[PDB]
Design a protein around this ligand. Structure first.
Ligand SMILES: Nc1nc2c(ncn2[C@H]2C[C@H](O)[C@@H](COP(=O)(O)NP(=O)(O)OP(=O)(O)O)O2)c(=O)[nH]1
Ligand SMILES: [Mn+2]
Ligand SMILES: [Mn+2]
Length: 425
DNA sequence: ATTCTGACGCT
């Protein structure tokens, strides 16, 4: 009872941009705004592969991983923006720079952990404490939460439902107790409204957010009312929320591990995990995963918001599927050089912006007919930012995969160069 | 023949 800690010590938010690459293209090209539109990579094979879809286009069934030619069958009016092509490959620089715009705004409010090109976690515990002291017992008005949903409310038109649930929540709040976790989350949500307003004012981009006591619940909360809304998931909301939540929806369980939880335990929903002992879960899934699962299904997770805004690696990849696979020495060399030229550009800019240098070069390849996504992964020293040296070293390190007797066999279906092991500069 | 990333765990 009094000694079962409840994982209510922190206020954590997850901010995720709405259809991010589409919004970047819509800001640049006003003719795309408020239209069914998507962003593709390449164009020749089936019109290109879609990686981002506006919410208008999602209403017709357009999804990521769809070929644009197929999406047009669902949505004949679909508008398309193509990712930039440089040195014969997709170049995501525009979206990386847009990401930095957003991250720099979020960093004004609190320490953030970049979790992807378009999302960051925010540790708001200290900011909430400061703001609670600033309010000096003053209640929290619904006007301060104009885009917030309270998960699980109302209890007992979409905007009308939203506001009913918010009123129920706010009428229940104990504002005089500076230590109430529910009040702390509410103040967190006020700050996140301010952060999201700043992002939209200063970039034009809309985003959604989750506010809860840890990263997993904040990420889950984010997706519940996208787009352009934020969602507060309280500790008390967890039993009902998890009682029908498929296990695969929880971050890290969308893959083989979640499938094995489902199959070994004979369950479907996160909440059903509560019926197992910590030792039982550790027995099936290992000591780390088992402890994590035991706490997670009760709404509890301890993973910190890491102070890390910048990527830890800078990588350059290209697939060569089907008959396009690289089958000569000259081909492999030329593409390694293209990859290294983009890597050198991004690294030189990184070194000037972020006062750091990469020290290790990772080379990964796939060969045709190989089941694995990495037929080989080998590292070497990254001593200078020179594309010719990096491409020559990558070839030196992969060349003994060639079984030919000028030819390359098995043909390569993927090349990948990644700079890692950064040190201050 | 979604492709192009990037974090993190295991051994
Ligand atoms: N190259 C590449 N980029 C991708 C891929 N998947 C996503 N991206 C890029 C394009 C995406 O815009 C961006 C962020 O991915 P999300 O946050 O998962 N989706 P979004 O923000 O579009 O919509 P929502 O409102 O549902 O969050 O990452 C992929 O497989 N490949
Ligand atoms: Mn997003
Ligand atoms: Mn995202």
């Amino acid at each position: 009872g009094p000694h079962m800690a409840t994982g209510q010590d922190r206020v954590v938010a997850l901010v995720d941009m709405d259809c991010f690459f589409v919004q970047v293209e819509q800001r640049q090209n006003p003719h795309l705004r408020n239209k069914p539109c998507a962003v593709v990579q390449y164009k020749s094979w089936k019109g290109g592969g879609i990686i981002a879809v506006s919410y208008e286009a999602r209403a017709f069934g357009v999804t990521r991983s769809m070929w644009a030619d197929d999406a047009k069958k669902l949505c004949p009016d679909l508008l398309l923006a193509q990712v930039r092509e440089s040195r014969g490959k997709a170049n995501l620089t525009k979206y990386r720079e847009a990401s930095v715009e957003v991250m720099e705004i979020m960093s004004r409010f609190a320490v953030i952990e970049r979790a992807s090109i378009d999302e960051a976690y925010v540790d708001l515990t200290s900011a909430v404490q400061e703001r609670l002291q600033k309010l000096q017992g003053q209640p929290i008005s619904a006007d301060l939460l104009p885009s917030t949903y309270i998960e699980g409310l109302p209890q007992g038109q979409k905007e009308g439902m939203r506001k009913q649930g918010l009123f129920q929540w706010l009428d229940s709040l104990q504002i005089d107790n500076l230590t109430s976790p529910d009040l702390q989350l509410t103040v967190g949500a006020v700050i996140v409204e301010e952060m999201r307003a700043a992002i939209e004012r200063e970039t034009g981009f809309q985003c959604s957010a989750g506010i809860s006591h840890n990263k997993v619940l904040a990420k889950l909360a984010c997706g519940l009312n996208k787009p352009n809304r934020q969602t507060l998931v309280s500790h008390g909301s967890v039993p009902q929320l998890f009682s029908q939540m498929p296990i695969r929806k929880i971050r890290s369980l969308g893959g083989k591990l979640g499938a094995s939880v489902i199959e070994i335990l004979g369950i479907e929903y996160m909440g059903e995990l509560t019926q197992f002992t910590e030792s039982q879960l550790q027995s099936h899934f290992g000591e780390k995963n088992g402890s994590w699962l035991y706490a997670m299904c009760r709404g509890i997770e301890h993973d910190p918001v890491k102070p890390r805004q910048l990527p830890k690696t800078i990588g350059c990849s290209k697939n060569f599927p089907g008959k396009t696979a690289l089958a000569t020495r000259e081909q492999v060399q030329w593409w390694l050089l293209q990859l290294a030229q983009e890597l050198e550009e991004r690294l030189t800019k990184d070194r000037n912006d972020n006062d750091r240098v990469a020290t290790q070069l990772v080379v990964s390849i796939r060969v045709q007919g190989d089941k694995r996504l990495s037929s080989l992964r080998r590292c070497c020293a990254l001593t200078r930012y020179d594309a010719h040296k990096m491409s020559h070293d990558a070839f030196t390190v992969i060349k003994n995969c060639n079984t030919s007797g000028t030819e390359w066999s098995p043909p390569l279906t993927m090349l990948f160069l990644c700079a890692t092991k950064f040190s201050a500069s």
